[PDB]
Ligand binder design. Structure first.
Ligand code: MG
Ligand code: MG
Ligand code: MG
Ligand code: MG
Ligand code: MG
Ligand code: MG
Ligand code: MG
Ligand code: MG
Lengths: 142, 152, 129
RNA sequence: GACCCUCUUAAGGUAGCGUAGUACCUUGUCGCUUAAUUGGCGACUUGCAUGAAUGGAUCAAUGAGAGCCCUACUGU
RNA sequence: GUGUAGACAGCAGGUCGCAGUGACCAGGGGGCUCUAACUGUCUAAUACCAACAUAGGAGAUUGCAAACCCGUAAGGGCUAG
RNA sequence: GCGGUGAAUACGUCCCUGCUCCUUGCACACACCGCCCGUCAAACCACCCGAGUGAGGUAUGGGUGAGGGCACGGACUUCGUGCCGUGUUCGAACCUGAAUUUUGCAAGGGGGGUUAAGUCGUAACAAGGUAGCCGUAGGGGAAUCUGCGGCUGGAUC
RNA sequence: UACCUACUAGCCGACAACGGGUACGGGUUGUGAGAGCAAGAGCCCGGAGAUGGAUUCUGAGACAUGAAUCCAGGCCCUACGGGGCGCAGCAGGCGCGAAAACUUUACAAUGCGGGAAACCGUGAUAAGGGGACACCGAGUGCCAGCAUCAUAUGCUGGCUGUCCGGAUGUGUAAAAUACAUCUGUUAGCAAGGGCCGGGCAAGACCGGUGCCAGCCGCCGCGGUAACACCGGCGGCCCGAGUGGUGAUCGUGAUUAUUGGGUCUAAAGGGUCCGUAGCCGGUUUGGUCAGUCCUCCGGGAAAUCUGACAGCUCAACUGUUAGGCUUUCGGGGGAUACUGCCAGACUUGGAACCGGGAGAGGUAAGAGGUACUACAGGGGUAGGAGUGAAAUCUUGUAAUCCCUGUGGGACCACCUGUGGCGAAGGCGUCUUACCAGAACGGGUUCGACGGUGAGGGACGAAAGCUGGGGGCACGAACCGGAUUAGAUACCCGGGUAGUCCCAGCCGUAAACGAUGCUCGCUAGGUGUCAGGCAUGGCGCGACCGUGUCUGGUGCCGCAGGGAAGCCGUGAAGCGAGCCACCUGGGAAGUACGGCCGCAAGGCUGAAACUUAAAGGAAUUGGCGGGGGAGCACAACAACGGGUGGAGCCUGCGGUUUA
């Protein structure tokens, strides 16, 4: 932050160091987001459902949130996936092929009163779980 | 402004008036003042108080106004100047005395800092003078060997 | 240490305008200071100015006629061409044909309107309005 | 099993270390080592019967000291 | 090439054998623990050790006609301290 | 509700207990029945150390070393981009010690977080009941405690 | 040096070498008002690669995508003696995954090699097929009259063919679309997608469910009246599109040169000295390198902008005027500006002298009082301490008093909203040594200056190492109380330590929570040093008021801040340099590194978790703050009784249909 005429180098250096204090630019250049998330920048995924858990909600609210436990096939990463909609666990069971996607909440992380769950189901056996929840599609016997 | 190593600013300047001419109320001449300067220099009196004794006992308002030359200009003209400037010699003399004192009082850290400040002033004077060719390029201020009173 | 006399003079003029003082003294005068004061006088923003020598760099007894709003130096003194004045004008100035930028040029020091008339650019010096 | 009290003829073992060169139960239980190990090392340790100059823990270097393992070697 | 010199160091090419420190001479190496710090000393004739000693640490007595010790005594060691 | 009879005490102060008002303090707003810290255990999650135990990359010396290229020598043929040999040259592949780097597993240990209607205290918030915070050192189940300097970001004097 | 030889001892790097991470480079693309910021798959330019790797033939040219050779690696045809192959060429297949087409057509054109030519080949190219690629253009309706609940199907009236189907020709290599006439339609075949509590445009309409099902980017909903959630009803926005999750730009001046903050919210480094860097006084003389105007060589097209021309409008192709390409090489003019050259100038800093000020520093010594140790004299039942106690201490005579001799620490009042010091910090006195300051100065110097990442010294207290000392104080420790407990506050002992001598660590709320330098900006107001006028003063050593300069405090206008506030001693207005912060935890933690004897200091993440944390201010409640006041649901002073005994009734719980 030198205001002299022949002081572009100092301003460039001090802007270079101060940029790192931002979380977003440093995490982008360091590649923490690619290294961390199971999908690796893939917008959705495909994992084998293993166990189904109706995980509880936050402290003020009170509810049970149906969350399958799914292991990815692209990477073999074990995570937890929240299945939305009424009758959510009715259209999904153990050992399925289900597309998964990020829950799209706070900072890309877990959304709402669901603690510790960041992934959500979007389709079971390559068909839309939203339409199964609505009632315009039927669960394949596969 | 603030001082060199203490930030205590001060304004005890010696207010010299706007005089573009020599005195009109004094009968002193350029030859008289230059003879007085040379005699006082040969006595062993430094240039800071040569002008002071000119201005006090002879009432000489300024040597440059009358003679057209300052004290050191007259010194260089007559080959009656030292090889080292008086400010650098004074700083080196004070530093040598302070080092002599500090070689027996090793707890006197405040005067160690005072010695460091005077060393900084000495290196500043040497850098300015080597910038302006008063002193040789290869003669660096050695604080242990090449710092004597008359350097040769 | 004193190391920007033109900016110091314009800051003093800014202070004197802000208090509304008709007159104010200018700390040590310079040739570019006199050129800026002459061009500002021809702009009508500043009334009068005299170099009163003091056996020193010299000072000014400037009579502020109450016509300006703020005036400081341009740091850095940017190089400017004939096709590069409008961005500085949009930055410093408040409005089109309102206030002028003091420019230093090989022809002479002058506001950028007359520099654009001259078709010669150079270094920005200051701004007054 | 982090508390009121004990058992208190002075005191109730602190730091550490712990199946030890000390540990009866005992070839204690778990991991590495092996096809297989009453062994070696690491960890746990309710310590029959550890513990601070009755010195405690730990230690580079040194050792014809005492165990175990790998490679090389070989009529062991 | 260095050196005064003895000698030492180095380079190019050729060539033999299974093998060129050709015999003699001449460390096998490494990792993890226990124990003692180390060099040293030790049961001459079954124990060369982890034992003894060691520097280091700490404690105690004594101001010299002392503390400690020898002698029956004369008088002595420590102490030409 | 009424009547008979008939007494001590206090010519009060706000100390006790409620309560009212102005000011100061406040981490309190469901307003002190407030908020609130740490250990301990239990469930779960992510992580770190871990004696160990693998896998992969880069580079390095070295090794064994396919194949090819020129040199030279020797023979067979249509007298050689052939053959044998030799020397030289480039050299893949594989093996190996260190170096470097990326990650899987691991008995056990660690602190972090988060969920009970957990247990234990009450450390801070008012002068939070011993003012607190800061550095440092010691002690204790745990908040924390004491000592030293410092500050006031502390009320009342 | 590409290799070899003799020789020299260099070369690159702290202005980032070497290494790690990542990546085909640019033309450009994304986005924004712009400065910028982010990516550079496709079209063109250059680069490299052919399973990984090495080697080689052929040729003008290769280490060849349709050449070989061998090794690794996988696969393959065999009559088992052997022989091939690698689609990062075009379609296609397996695998892979969130992740993408036809094994169509033709040399007709544009190119290329071949030929002398005629011409042949061409998965180059063109032509299509398929894929909610990007853009652009259209339509599913139109429509008079008439009716309710104001736009829905009505009743009716006709009318058009952009679409869809057909005919026919233009047409292309031949297709197809497109294209023209005709004509097929009861205008019927051709609309969906999200969402409805807020942010945000849309329903406080009716049943369901009951902290459950669910919603929810965030906020927030539901444990009984859900505009919130499910169907409905209705409504809303968009439009052959419409959403979701990343990403990325903008939002966001949330990376800030433009353009941010850093007293109390995250953030000034403990102070300071100081290199590279960076910033720099007025001034004469000379140059013209940055700079400036201009010229000439460039900066491929493509994409960008506008128009014209031509595709029906459109995007699109050509011409053209601009843009980008940039921020190159070289000439002429100018000399303000800055950098270069040589002086000067006195104010900035530097140097010297004068009378004064100062708990400024080291070194030495002496001193003040208290305390304490022992001893002596007197005296005799307790002293000490507490909220109250006890330990403790005392009959071995303490406490208290008197005398005397040693001891170590400690420097009171004086003392100040005083002073000196870089900060830390410094209070007995004397002396020696040293240093800075302000003040006075027709004194010497001539810009010699500011700041300053790295780096260096100083650095409170605690702690550590070695030697001393130990009166007092006093972590630990022990004991006595307090309490439910007390490992605490209280009290009795008291070790290390505080002190000194020689070193180390290097941190504090090291604070003014305000880095340092300069100019500038109303005032009123203590006091301190110096200087200076004057009145008094034993008209002297001295003390008063005024005034300039430099400090040291309070008050406060303008100014600014979110405010508390700051306010010539800025947090005001400009100049310069540096340090520092970028939502709250995890965390000043882990790993690596340096530093230290150690404790530790320095550097410093990530996973994960979370919607706030936080700052000033304010209205109340509240306190074991303060002040004021009041009342037998307070107190004092009183009188009685309930509580005791029996009965009566009411509440709880046992029983109970
Ligand atoms: Mg064995
Ligand atoms: Mg030994
Ligand atoms: Mg021994
Ligand atoms: Mg692990
Ligand atoms: Mg304690
Ligand atoms: Mg302090
Ligand atoms: Mg100290
Ligand atoms: Mg500070």
């Amino acid at each position: 932050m030198a205001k002299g005429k022949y002081a572009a180098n100092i301003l460039k250096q001090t802007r270079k160091d101060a940029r790192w204090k931002d979380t977003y630019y440093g995490r982008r250049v360091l590649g923490l987001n690619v290294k961390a998330d199971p999908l690796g920048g893939a917008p959705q995924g495909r994992g084998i459902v293993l166990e189904k858990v109706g995980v509880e909600a936050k402290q003020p609210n009170s509810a049970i949130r149906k969350c399958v436990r799914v292991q990815l096939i692209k990477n073999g990463r074990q995570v937890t996936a929240f299945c939305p909609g009424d009758g959510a666990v009715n259209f999904i069971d153990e050992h399925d092929e289900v597309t998964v996607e990020k829950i799209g909440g706070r900072m890309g992380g877990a959304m709402g009163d669901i603690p510790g769950v960041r992934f959500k189901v979007i389709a079971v056996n390559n068909v839309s779980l939203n339409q199964l929840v609505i009632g315009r599609m039927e669960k394949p016997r596969r | 402004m603030a001082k060199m190593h203490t930030k205590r600013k001060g304004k005890s300047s010696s207010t010299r008036p706007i005089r573009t001419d020599p005195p009109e109320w004094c009968k002193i001449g350029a030859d008289e003042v230059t003879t007085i300067v040379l005699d006082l220099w040969k006595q062993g009196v430094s240039t800071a108080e040569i002008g002071m004794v000119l201005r006090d006992r002879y009432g000489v308002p300024d040597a440059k106004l009358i003679t057209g030359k300052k004290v050191t200009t007259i010194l260089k003209e007559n080959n009656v100047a030292p090889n080292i400037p008086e400010d650098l010699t004074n700083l080196i003399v004070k530093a040598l005395g302070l080092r002599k004192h500090l070689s027996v009082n090793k707890k006197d850290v405040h005067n160690k800092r005072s010695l460091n400040l005077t060393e900084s002033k000495i290196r500043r004077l040497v850098k300015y003078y080597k910038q302006e060719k008063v002193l040789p390029r290869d003669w660096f201020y050695k604080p242990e060997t090449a710092e004597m009173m008359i350097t040769r | 240490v004193l190391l920007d006399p033109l900016a110091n003079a314009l800051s003093t003029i800014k202070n004197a305008e802000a208090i509304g003082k008709s007159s104010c003294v200018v700390r040590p005068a310079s040739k570019n200071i006199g050129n800026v004061l002459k061009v500002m006088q021809d702009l009508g923003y500043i009334g009068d100015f005299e170099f009163i020598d003091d056996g020193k760099a010299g000072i000014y007894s400037v009579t502020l006629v109450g016509r300006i709003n703020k005036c400081g130096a341009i740091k850095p003194r940017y190089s400017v061409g004939t096709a590069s004045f409008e961005r500085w004008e949009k930055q410093f100035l408040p409005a089109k044909n309102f206030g002028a930028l003091i420019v230093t040029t090989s022809s002479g020091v002058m506001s950028q309107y007359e520099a654009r008339d001259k078709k010669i650019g150079g270094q920005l010096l200051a701004y007054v309005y």
